[PDB]
Design an enzyme around this catalytic site. Structure first.
Site, PDB file in Angstrom:
ATOM      1  N   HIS B  75       0.827  -1.210   0.000  1.00 46.89           N
ATOM      2  CA  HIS B  75       0.000   0.000   0.000  1.00 46.89           C
ATOM      3  C   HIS B  75       0.865   1.266   0.000  1.00 46.89           C
ATOM      4  CE1 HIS B  75      -3.055  -2.988   1.372  1.00 46.89           C
ATOM      5  NE2 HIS B  75      -3.768  -2.306   0.495  1.00 46.89           N
ATOM      6  N   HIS B  79       1.316   1.230  -5.787  1.00 42.93           N
ATOM      7  CA  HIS B  79      -0.098   0.841  -5.780  1.00 42.93           C
ATOM      8  C   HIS B  79      -0.998   1.990  -6.229  1.00 42.93           C
ATOM      9  CE1 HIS B  79      -3.881  -0.935  -4.730  1.00 42.93           C
ATOM     10  NE2 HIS B  79      -4.102  -0.094  -3.736  1.00 42.93           N
ATOM     11  N   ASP B 116      -5.435   5.443  -1.059  1.00 38.80           N
ATOM     12  CA  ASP B 116      -4.744   4.764   0.036  1.00 38.80           C
ATOM     13  C   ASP B 116      -3.665   5.634   0.687  1.00 38.80           C
ATOM     14  OD1 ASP B 116      -5.977   2.261   0.431  1.00 38.80           O
ATOM     15  OD2 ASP B 116      -4.905   1.357  -1.253  1.00 38.80           O
ATOM     16  N   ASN B 236      -4.985  -6.446  -9.681  1.00 41.24           N
ATOM     17  CA  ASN B 236      -3.728  -7.187  -9.798  1.00 41.24           C
ATOM     18  C   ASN B 236      -3.909  -8.555 -10.452  1.00 41.24           C
ATOM     19  OD1 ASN B 236      -2.464  -6.180  -6.499  1.00 41.24           O
ATOM     20  ND2 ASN B 236      -2.691  -4.973  -8.410  1.00 41.24           N
ATOM     21  N   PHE B 287      -8.957 -16.028  -3.115  1.00 40.74           N
ATOM     22  CA  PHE B 287      -9.361 -14.634  -3.296  1.00 40.74           C
ATOM     23  C   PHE B 287      -9.919 -14.387  -4.698  1.00 40.74           C
ATOM     24  CE2 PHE B 287      -8.338  -9.943  -3.520  1.00 40.74           C
ATOM     25  CZ  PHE B 287      -9.269  -9.571  -2.560  1.00 40.74           C
TER      26      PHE B 287
HETATM   27  C1  LIG Z   1     -10.103 -11.309   5.541  1.00 45.46           C
HETATM   28  O1  LIG Z   1     -10.653 -11.434   4.228  1.00 45.46           O
HETATM   29  C2  LIG Z   1      -9.721 -11.493   3.210  1.00 45.46           C
HETATM   30  C3  LIG Z   1      -9.125 -12.718   2.891  1.00 45.46           C
HETATM   31  O2  LIG Z   1      -9.416 -13.836   3.614  1.00 45.46           O
HETATM   32  C4  LIG Z   1      -8.196 -12.798   1.865  1.00 45.46           C
HETATM   33  C5  LIG Z   1      -7.843 -11.647   1.181  1.00 45.46           C
HETATM   34  O3  LIG Z   1      -6.847 -11.803   0.224  1.00 45.46           O
HETATM   35  C6  LIG Z   1      -6.321 -10.701  -0.430  1.00 45.46           C
HETATM   36  C7  LIG Z   1      -5.339 -10.966  -1.372  1.00 45.46           C
HETATM   37  C8  LIG Z   1      -4.777  -9.905  -2.060  1.00 45.46           C
HETATM   38  C9  LIG Z   1      -5.147  -8.571  -1.806  1.00 45.46           C
HETATM   39  C10 LIG Z   1      -6.165  -8.342  -0.876  1.00 45.46           C
HETATM   40  O4  LIG Z   1      -6.623  -7.038  -0.832  1.00 45.46           O
HETATM   41  C11 LIG Z   1      -6.346  -6.204   0.304  1.00 45.46           C
HETATM   42  C12 LIG Z   1      -7.291  -5.029   0.248  1.00 45.46           C
HETATM   43  C13 LIG Z   1      -7.765  -4.556  -0.964  1.00 45.46           C
HETATM   44  C14 LIG Z   1      -8.539  -3.408  -0.983  1.00 45.46           C
HETATM   45  N1  LIG Z   1      -8.875  -2.721   0.116  1.00 45.46           N
HETATM   46  C15 LIG Z   1      -8.428  -3.203   1.279  1.00 45.46           C
HETATM   47  C16 LIG Z   1      -7.647  -4.340   1.393  1.00 45.46           C
HETATM   48  C17 LIG Z   1      -6.780  -9.398  -0.171  1.00 45.46           C
HETATM   49  C18 LIG Z   1      -7.890  -9.196   0.782  1.00 45.46           C
HETATM   50  O5  LIG Z   1      -8.434  -8.108   0.899  1.00 45.46           O
HETATM   51  C19 LIG Z   1      -8.402 -10.393   1.490  1.00 45.46           C
HETATM   52  C20 LIG Z   1      -9.385 -10.323   2.530  1.00 45.46           C
HETATM   53  C21 LIG Z   1     -10.072  -9.040   2.944  1.00 45.46           C
HETATM   54  C22 LIG Z   1     -11.335  -8.786   2.168  1.00 45.46           C
HETATM   55  C23 LIG Z   1     -12.585  -9.007   2.556  1.00 45.46           C
HETATM   56  C24 LIG Z   1     -13.666  -9.393   1.593  1.00 45.46           C
HETATM   57  C25 LIG Z   1     -13.039  -8.879   3.980  1.00 45.46           C
HETATM   58  C26 LIG Z   1      -4.492  -7.524  -2.550  1.00 45.46           C
HETATM   59  C27 LIG Z   1      -3.700  -7.827  -3.568  1.00 45.46           C
HETATM   60  C28 LIG Z   1      -3.594  -9.226  -4.092  1.00 45.46           C
HETATM   61  C29 LIG Z   1      -2.197  -9.503  -4.624  1.00 45.46           C
HETATM   62  C30 LIG Z   1      -4.659  -9.485  -5.148  1.00 45.46           C
HETATM   63  O6  LIG Z   1      -3.842 -10.202  -3.023  1.00 45.46           O
HETATM   64 MG   LIG Z   2      -7.503   0.948   0.591  1.00 46.57          MG
HETATM   65 ZN   LIG Z   3      -5.935   0.134  -2.593  1.00 44.20          ZN
END
Ligand SMILES: COc1c(O)cc2oc3cc4c(c(OCc5ccncc5)c3c(=O)c2c1CC=C(C)C)C=CC(C)(C)O4
Ligand SMILES: [Mg+2]
Ligand SMILES: [Zn+2]
Ligand SMILES: COc1c(O)cc2oc3cc4c(c(OCc5ccncc5)c3c(=O)c2c1CC=C(C)C)C=CC(C)(C)O4
Ligand SMILES: [Mg+2]
Ligand SMILES: [Zn+2]
Lengths: 325, 326
Positions: B75, B79, B116, B236, B287
């Site tokens: 972040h 990003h 962000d 991504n 995810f």
């Molecule tokens: C706790 O829940 C999870 C989860 O179990 C897995 C998650 O995996 C992610 C994998 C990610 C990213 C994630 O995003 C973080 C995020 C994105 C946007 N706003 C806040 C946080 C999560 C996650 O955000 C992510 C989340 C959080 C999202 C929700 C729906 C509550 C960002 C980048 C890439 C490389 C695609 O991998």
């Molecule tokens: Mg954010």
């Molecule tokens: Zn973001």
């Protein structure tokens, strides 16, 4: 004289407590003494293992953060909403329906719900590009701030009145207080009342009287509307109290219109001391806001609010009669 | 300058999915956000349309970029630049031609740039659970997202930083509201309701005689911009794999550092934050399957067939990560 203060506090469970006298007799500490009394009366001190000195220390710090030079949104209004919520919590139609933590939440929320109020509206804060509106992105600007200050003062020396709650109680109380105080934002009145109406038409009761609420969603709605009713309870108090509330809110509004005037800003409704109609505004606010709310709350607790609703309707009639033909 | 010739060459790709944003970060002296925003404002003629002095734009962009944390792995300013540029591409999709005003385009791009800023590298839930000052200020509600907005708007008040100085009052007020609505919609706790609303719009979709999406009212217009920036935030896994992999490396490092702090304090470690119990590949597949693909398939439906190649890349990348599960 402390003796007279003790005697007025004997009415702490009655609608129409003598809160301005209590404020005078307590040394401008009505929030502290009324909260202290309500806690003792409800026995929350030992239910939740609060050190009495920590209670008093917190209450006094909290009261200190209500502004002395704000005519309406000050510690007397806080004490009044606290004592008013305390009464509405004791309505038979809701007896022991709320846990001791749901009770602590609504009373704590009532006490902090306007803390550090600057005496101008959310809309004024937005239009003047205030630090507050910048911080809170124009959404429930004041109500978010009241919460943040009310919780932050718990971290002052010997102020954590929740130190002997379990961590789950603390997180449950926090969420409930946030949900309640954010609901005092007047821009949310109509949705809040629509929700209260829906709950009245699908209402369910132990036919013997007491109300049946099963899920958190409805129980928080009732606590939100309860503290909202308490926030909007001035026109339901005895007229001599109500008239004092009207004087103060108009003085506070007029000072805001004076700030809008010095700035060349447009003057908000009811803030123009050269184009005001104090009585028509009260009748109007009763007709469109306060009576629809209190009528729905009386239906919800039928007939426990009848002595509250009659007073409101008496006060509306009186105010209307001060308007000539 | 040689290095500037090459940066300028790379910036010719600003209209393409899969821009080499990491190369641009290196080539620009760790200024990907400034150079990509500037390039996009020139490309869309925004400086002329809104009378933005170029020196004001650069000054604000550099101050904004400075307030992303260079020591946070995901972040950060890279990003931010990536989400700006992805939103820029999504805005240009044929199904949306002439739909949005210059002011709405400005709002979506500006929201993407600030969305962000000053992110500390830990989640909302972490900030709530550790009783942080941020969660105390914002009452546990969209804690980070409110903060990004507050910082992004505040920096406009710094010396020679107000890039909106020549908008009308009404334009500023409408821009401010739209940006707030967009950035608050990046809160992942709003994703399910946001996607459910997008599904409804796809199911009842109206187009114009020219085949372009028809948006009658603020509610539908802001909803499309909200999901657009949210898609860009979750883009991504749709990018060429060599880009996606670096984003995955970075989110895992940032998640692992939060999990160390959680472990230091006796807290339960959040999902994907335990570097001793991690399954990177399986979590990306999870995810994609439960969050990213449901969103991007719905966005692809809204603009069908404009986004088919992006969806195809997403599904290839999903299959690739899946194929690497031991
Ligand atoms: C706790 O829940 C999870 C989860 O179990 C897995 C998650 O995996 C992610 C994998 C990610 C990213 C994630 O995003 C973080 C995020 C994105 C946007 N706003 C806040 C946080 C999560 C996650 O955000 C992510 C989340 C959080 C999202 C929700 C729906 C509550 C960002 C980048 C890439 C490389 C695609 O991998
Ligand atoms: Mg954010
Ligand atoms: Zn973001
Ligand atoms: C601008 O709209 C009016 C309005 O035209 C008249 C109003 O009159 C009031 C009269 C009042 C009080 C009012 O409440 C101020 C308030 C209450 C709660 N939270 C914020 C402000 C309003 C009013 O709040 C009030 C309002 C409500 C505002 C909105 C956005 C629904 C408080 C005390 C007494 C003495 C009953 O007179
Ligand atoms: Mg208030
Ligand atoms: Zn109040």
């Amino acid at each position: 004289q402390e003796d007279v203060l003790a005697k007025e506090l004997e009415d702490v469970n009655k609608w129409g407590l003598h809160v301005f006298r209590i404020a005078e007799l307590s040394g401008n500490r009505p929030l502290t003494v009324i909260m202290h009394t309500i806690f003792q009366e409800r026995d929350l001190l030992k239910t939740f293992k609060i050190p009495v000195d920590t209670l008093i220390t917190y209450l006094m710090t909290l009261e200190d953060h209500y502004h002395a030079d704000v005519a309406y949104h000050n510690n007397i209004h806080a004490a009044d909403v606290v004592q008013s919520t305390h009464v509405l919590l004791s309505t038979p139609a809701l007896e022991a329906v709320f846990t001791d933590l749901e009770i602590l939440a609504a009373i704590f929320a009532s006490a902090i719900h306007d803390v550090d109020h600057p005496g101008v509206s959310n809309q004024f804060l937005i239009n003047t590009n205030s630090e507050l509106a910048l911080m809170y992105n124009d959404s429930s600007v004041l109500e978010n701030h009241h919460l943040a200050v009310g919780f932050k003062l718990l971290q002052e020396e010997n102020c954590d009145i929740f130190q002997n709650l379990t961590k789950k109680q603390r997180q449950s109380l926090r969420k409930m207080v946030i949900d309640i105080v954010l609901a005092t934002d007047m821009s949310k009145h109509m949705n809040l009342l629509a929700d209260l109406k829906t709950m009245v038409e699908t209402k369910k009761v132990t036919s013997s009287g007491v109300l049946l609420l099963d899920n958190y969603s409805d129980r928080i709605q009732v606590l939100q509307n309860m503290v909202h009713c308490a926030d909007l309870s001035n026109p339901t108090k005895p007229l001599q109290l109500y008239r004092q509330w009207t004087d103060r809110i108009m003085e506070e509004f007029f000072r805001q219109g004076d700030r809008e005037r010095e700035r060349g800003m447009e003057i908000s409704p009811m803030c123009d001391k050269h184009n005001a109609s104090v009585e028509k505004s009260q009748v109007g606010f009763i007709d469109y806001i306060v009576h629809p709310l209190w009528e729905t709350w009386a239906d919800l607790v039928h007939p426990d609010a009848q002595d509250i609703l009659d007073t409101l309707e008496d006060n509306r009639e009186w105010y209307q009669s001060t308007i000539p033909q």
